Prior knowledge:
The protein is α/β, with parallel strands linked by helices. It has three domains: 1-88, Immunoglobulin-like, CATH 2.60.40.3010; 89-312, Rossmann fold, CATH 3.40.50.11120; 313-474, Rossmann fold (3-Layer(aba) Sandwich), CATH 3.40.50.11110. The chain is 32% helix and 26% strand. The chain is built from 18 helices and 21 strands. The chain has helices spanning 100-115, 132-137, 152-163, 179-182, 184-190, 209-217, 223-229, 231-239, 270-273, 278-284, 295-298, 301-311, 315-324, 344-359, 383-390, 404-409, 447-452, 454-462, and strands spanning 2-12, 16-19, 30-37, 52-55, 63-72, 77-87, 90-96, 120-125, 140-142, 145-146, 149-150, 168-175, 196-204, 261-265, 288-290, 329-333, 372-376, 396-397, 416-420, 433-439, 470-473. The protein has a seven-stranded parallel beta sheet with strand order 9-8-7-12-13-14-15. Strands 18-17-16-19-20-21 form a six-stranded parallel beta sheet. Strands 1-6-5-3 form a four-stranded mixed beta sheet, with no helix packed on it. The longest helix has 16 residues, at 100-115. Bound molecules: calcium ion (CA). Residues 322, 325, 327, 329, 372 line the site of calcium ion. Belongs to the PhoU family. Keywords: Calcium, Cytoplasm, Glycosyltransferase, Metal-binding, Phosphate transport, Transferase, Transport.
Amino acid sequence: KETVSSNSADVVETETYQLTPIDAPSSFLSHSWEQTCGTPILNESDKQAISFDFVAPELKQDEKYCFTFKGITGDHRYITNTTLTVVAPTLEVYIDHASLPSLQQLIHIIQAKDEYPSNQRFVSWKRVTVDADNANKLNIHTYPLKGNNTSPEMVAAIDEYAQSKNRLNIEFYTNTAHVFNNLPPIIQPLYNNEKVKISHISLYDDGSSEYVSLYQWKDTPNKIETLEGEVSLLANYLAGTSPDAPKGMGNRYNWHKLYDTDYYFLREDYLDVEANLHDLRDYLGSSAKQMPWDEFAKLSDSQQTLFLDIVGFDKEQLQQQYSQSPLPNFIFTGTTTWAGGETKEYYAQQQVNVINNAINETSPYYLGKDYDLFFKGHPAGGVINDIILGSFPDMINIPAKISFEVLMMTDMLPDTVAGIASSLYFTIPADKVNFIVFTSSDTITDREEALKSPLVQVMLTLGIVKEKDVLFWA
Ligand SMILES: [Ca+2]
């Protein structure tokens, strides 16, 4: 009667792995450990041990070590084959000032803590706060940003961490639009150090901003040729052999030419539907990826609870509120103020008028059916929020501290969304966008100027809205 068990594991340099039989009895007529590959490391005494410690050495490169345990009872032979790979430590570095990249990164961290329990994480987020308990649960050390970008504090901490290791891999996670502001200050002083490798870069769209920039860039003559030409410009800048850096797209969409890089697109299909971006689609190739929305649902219940706790979203309360009335649910997107020099009771009153129109059956912009009212005012809306809320007794408030990206990622979008237009709509599925309202600004003074604005043009191309869905409110 024969049993063979096999397994494999990565062991970080200087850490310990206990070699042991897999699912075997605790005693044997005879037994032995053998090493079958890798630099000899097995102690003589351990050959007759049942379990013993493998302490990963510090090496010039990764190396696998194979061990076989053979154990014999009177009716059964047990074999365990364990292959251990000694690997460099990995430092994960997270830098973001916006919401969506930080939220995506947080999900990744929750996953990676379980899959890679030895990895240290350095985190600089502006809009996501991790308290001490959660930071320790996730092996996070937090560092401030300098304004919106990488701080000297973080640069120094990374330098010190690297100096402390025999070898090191660094993974970067940051936002696409400002990757050039965030990563070179870390890469440059490390560049000359052969023991430090940038093993991966994950870039995440912040929101509509990357799409406005692509829209404004798509008709640039010779744009891919210029992009190609600036690879060396980026490279020499990182290498410290030139003080000159690429400007524009060349410092954003060339990273995959130099490092293993993923670009997570909020709307990757923009690269398909906009014909003048087919050349960028081709240039990015497999490095362009679709940002996922369902990873939260694939987390465990406790992992989900941790996420929700960190972002401060009482999901169950909102689900209860959605279910209070059996009517489908409508979220009105509120704003603070706009142009006109107006009083605050006007900006609130105008928003009240929009909502009134939405729920008025005789209005041409009627939502279409009876909905329960919900309100998401601007995080700094203040008494405007209070005035608007007080005008609709049954309307349920959704705390402004709770970003719209959180709703989408936790599958908590309502049945329909409408109100004052902003970048949040870029994030919502088309069948859930009822209408968006533009107000007077420095650049928008009537409906026609709203429709021609870059943001709307991209949303029209992506089919998020149709022109009829775009309204103007002086
Ligand atoms: Ca309801």
